[PDB]
Design a protein around this nucleic acid. Structure first.
Ligand SMILES: [Mg+2]
Ligand SMILES: [Mg+2]
Ligand SMILES: [Mg+2]
Ligand SMILES: [Mg+2]
Ligand SMILES: [Mg+2]
Ligand SMILES: [Mg+2]
Ligand SMILES: [Mg+2]
Ligand SMILES: [Mg+2]
Ligand SMILES: [Mg+2]
Ligand SMILES: [Mg+2]
Ligand SMILES: [Mg+2]
Ligand SMILES: [Mg+2]
Ligand SMILES: [Mg+2]
Ligand SMILES: [Mg+2]
Ligand SMILES: [Mg+2]
Ligand SMILES: [Mg+2]
Ligand SMILES: [Mg+2]
Ligand SMILES: [Mg+2]
Ligand SMILES: [Mg+2]
Ligand SMILES: [Mg+2]
Ligand SMILES: [Mg+2]
Ligand SMILES: [Mg+2]
Ligand SMILES: [Mg+2]
Ligand SMILES: [Mg+2]
Ligand SMILES: [Mg+2]
Ligand SMILES: [Mg+2]
Ligand SMILES: [Mg+2]
Ligand SMILES: [Zn+2]
Lengths: 138, 186, 52, 201
RNA sequence: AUUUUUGGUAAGCAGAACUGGCGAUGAGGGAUGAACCUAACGUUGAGAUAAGGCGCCCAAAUGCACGCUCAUCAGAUACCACAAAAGGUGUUGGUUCAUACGGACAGCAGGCCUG
RNA sequence: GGCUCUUCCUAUCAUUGUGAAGCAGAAUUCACAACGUGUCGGAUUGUUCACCCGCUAAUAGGGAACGUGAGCUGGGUUUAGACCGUCGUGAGACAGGUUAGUUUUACCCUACUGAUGAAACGAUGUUGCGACAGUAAUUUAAGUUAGUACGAGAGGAACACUU
């Protein structure tokens, strides 16, 4: 029982900003502060090409700082904000000031209620529960 | 070993006319004219008499000998073909999804849609001399008529085959268009 | 559907013979295999009939 | 694992029996050479089917028991134990060796026993009644498949396991010249001391 | 190396016997190449050969007669560069038992028999 | 041994088209034409191997002087320093652990990559032909098909079209 099943469509092209090992903020109230990036789904690489995730992706991660109940296990998360500038159909490039993610079950459900900070557009279309829990969506 | 002489005798009946030139056989009857080219065998095709046609092969080996009777039989088919034609009936078989059919006025083409519920369009163009027909009373059948056995049997084939079911147990599914009746005389 | 027809299909589909060697489906009631790989081998079986 | 039979197939050696020069030669997996109804009379099983090794080779005892067990199961099931006498003519006398630092001396311990067979030596013999000849011929052929290379199957016109031709056998029947022990028949000559012949009882 | 041989699963392995040979040896043939086949060498011309060849590379038969063979993996030969158990309604021979106008086989027929 | 790179094998892991099943569907297994293309990111270990964490259509098995040191690297192995253990009276020894311990030369020929280029049927431009050589795209997912066919139920496809 794994994967991204609750994704609602195609995810747009975003410059991949979070390779493996990347540690990002965790914006949910799950009680985990951060997410250590282990893999990213749907990737077959080239030799020695680091697996990379971006806004909207579903990663496989672990919790480095947070509730002792959460760390030491392998969880899935969904990237919300990234600091790596990507580009949108208007030609403008954007970025947030942090790298943020929300722990989720493979079905696309969040474990948590409030999501701290804004969530990127590119995450909403893909993940309606995440979108539901957004305070703001840019 | 090598066989000396082998012959086969083809009868020619009322209203049939036959022509052998350099292995090229022509047969004209009431229903039309059919021609076939035998240039590939060393056989002797004797000048036909309105009664008969004699086929001979000389200094032959077992493999060669068979070509005789087979060319002969092909002739039998040309003849019978121009006397009484050839008609086939193909039953159109489906379990759940009804096979939908559109046949042109020439009778020269068939469209098959909705096979196993597939959204694809099947196109089959009938061979020369072959006419396809479906009536109100046909009870889900097709009818292919023509003078030349080959073109008709082959058209039936192309049809049956266009609809072969794939990537599933063939013995349970069994959807398809199959030949119910072969070698009918009209 | 329509056993009158099921007959037909089943005769086109389940009613053949299979080569214990090249796997080809040969005509029922036939003695030999028509495929070069086995040299027309003797041993053949009935294509396994469906269930009841 | 046991070394492949193709190693010992050809008889390259001079014969190595289990002798007082051989220590710790093992046994042979074929211990019993007779199956079926052994008690039968020459009269009861007239016809013989023989497996004759066509080749010159060394057959492993294990191979023997193989072909044998096989032929037995076949015969017993398809006719009846009562209806066949199955005899293994050949015995596995020859001992194979196997050399198990380097080559310093290669003389090996005893691996197993084999029977040394020459072209035309009878391997198996079955005696049966006419109705069953085919079945015998059948199972023997199958046992031929448990065997190295070529062997052939044959029907003898002699009587059972006897040296007599069925004709001689019949004439000697008629004339009361025959004495019966099991598979064996004895013939009576003019050379015998009269204290034997039945008449001076 | 031929034949005979022992140890060894085996080896272009390790050992022995008789006669040679190769080493110490060229020439023609095995395309090629120590120990195979012919054949043993002074300088040179002719003729006829051995081994092996004669469609072209290549001297010399696309000679003249027989049988057998079609490969959607043909075949093409001593030592030599490997193939086995097992299979084929491909084709041709041969072996042993059978049928047939007191009409067979097969097919279609028809009621084992019958057209 | 790894790194780098190229090519070959097929006893095919995946992808293409099929045959077979104790093939309902889904999944799976056996076989055929077949390498054309692909066959990944990290823990520990000098490692080949092994074992785990993962993604993936798949995470196939091999060859090329156990491919590849004037291409690197030098962790392992195998000099000279030194520790322990065991052995030896000893000097010393381990097919047992530890720790420190140099990696030279290309300007030649070829090879390959690129670059000029004399000269025949007169010279010199411009526009072309094209022998031959090399070739390249391979997959995946989503929508729709559709909660559909099949199936008692659980479950659960495909072709076409579109991105
Ligand atoms: Mg860390
Ligand atoms: Mg790497
Ligand atoms: Mg299939
Ligand atoms: Mg299936
Ligand atoms: Mg076979
Ligand atoms: Mg001799
Ligand atoms: Mg020697
Ligand atoms: Mg000698
Ligand atoms: Mg000699
Ligand atoms: Mg010397
Ligand atoms: Mg010499
Ligand atoms: Mg001369
Ligand atoms: Mg000629
Ligand atoms: Mg293969
Ligand atoms: Mg197998
Ligand atoms: Mg690494
Ligand atoms: Mg190396
Ligand atoms: Mg040291
Ligand atoms: Mg001491
Ligand atoms: Mg040491
Ligand atoms: Mg220099
Ligand atoms: Mg160059
Ligand atoms: Mg000019
Ligand atoms: Mg010019
Ligand atoms: Mg130019
Ligand atoms: Mg080309
Ligand atoms: Mg889809
Ligand atoms: Zn076959």
């Amino acid at each position: 029982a794994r994967g991204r099943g609750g994704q609602v469509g195609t995810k747009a092209k975003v410059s991949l900003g979070l390779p493996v090992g990347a540690v990002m903020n965790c914006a949910d109230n799950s009680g985990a502060k951060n997410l250590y990036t282990i893999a990213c789904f749907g990737i077959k690489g080239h030799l020695s090409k680091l697996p990379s995730a971006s806004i909207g992706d579903m990663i496989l991660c672990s919790v480095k700082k947070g509730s002792p109940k959460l760390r030491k296990k392998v969880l899935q998360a969904i990237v919300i904000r990234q600091r790596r500038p990507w580009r949108r159909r208007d030609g403008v490039f954007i970025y947030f000031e942090d790298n943020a993610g929300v722990i989720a079950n493979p079905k696309g459900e969040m474990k948590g209620s409030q999501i701290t900070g804004p969530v990127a557009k590119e995450c909403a279309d893909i993940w309606p529960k995440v979108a539901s829990n957004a305070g703001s969506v840019v | 070993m090598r066989h000396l002489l082998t012959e086969v005798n083809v009868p020619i009946p009322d209203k049939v006319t036959i022509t052998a030139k350099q292995r090229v056989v022509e047969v004209k009857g009431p229903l039309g004219t059919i021609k076939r080219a035998f240039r590939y065998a060393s056989v002797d095709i004797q000048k036909p008499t309105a009664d008969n046609v004699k086929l001979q092969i000389w200094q032959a080996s077992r493999k060669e000998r068979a070509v005789l009777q087979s060319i002969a039989s092909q002739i039998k088919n040309m003849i019978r073909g121009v006397t009484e034609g050839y008609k086939f009936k193909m039953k159109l078989a489906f379990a759940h999804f009804p096979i939908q059919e559109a046949v042109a006025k020439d009778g020269s083409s068939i469209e098959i849609k909705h096979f196993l519920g597939e959204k694809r369009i099947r196109r089959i163009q009938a061979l020369p001399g072959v006419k396809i027909s479906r009536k109100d009373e046909e009870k889900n059948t097709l009818t292919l008529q023509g003078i030349d056995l080959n073109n008709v049997s082959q058209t039936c084939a192309l049809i049956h085959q266009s609809c072969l079911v794939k990537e599933k147990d063939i013995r349970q599914f069994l959807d398809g268009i199959y030949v119910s009746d072969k070698r009918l005389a009209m | 559907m329509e056993p009158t027809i099921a007959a037909l299909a089943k005769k086109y589909n389940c009613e053949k013979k299979v080569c214990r060697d090249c796997y080809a489906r040969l005509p029922p009631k036939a003695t030999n295999c028509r495929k070069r790989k086995c040299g027309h081998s003797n041993s053949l079986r009935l294509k396994k009939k469906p269930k009841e | 694992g046991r070394r492949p039979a193709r190693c010992y197939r050809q008889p390259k050696g001079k014969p190595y029996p289990k002798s007082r020069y051989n220590r710790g030669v093992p046994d042979a997996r074929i211990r019993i050479y007779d199956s079926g109804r052994k008690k039968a009379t020459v009269e009861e099983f007239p016809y013989v089917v023989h497996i004759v090794s066509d080749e010159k080779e060394q057959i492993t005892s294990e191979a023997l028991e193989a072909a044998r067990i096989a032929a037995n199961k076949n015969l017993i099931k398809f006719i009846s134990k009562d209806a066949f006498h199955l005899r293994c003519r050949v015995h596995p006398w020859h001992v194979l060796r196997i050399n198990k630092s380097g080559m310093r001396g290669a003389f090996g311990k005893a691996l197993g026993k084999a029977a040394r067979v020459d072209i035309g030596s009878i391997l198996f013999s079955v005696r049966v009644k006419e109705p069953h000849v085919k079945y015998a011929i059948d199972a023997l052929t199958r046992a031929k498949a448990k065997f190295p290379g070529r062997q052939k199957v044959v029907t003898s016109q002699k009587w059972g396991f006897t040296k007599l031709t069925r004709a001689q056998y019949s004439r000697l029947r008629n004339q009361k010249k025959l004495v019966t022990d099991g598979s064996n028949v004895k013939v009576i000559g003019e050379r015998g001391p009269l204290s034997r012949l039945e008449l001076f009882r």
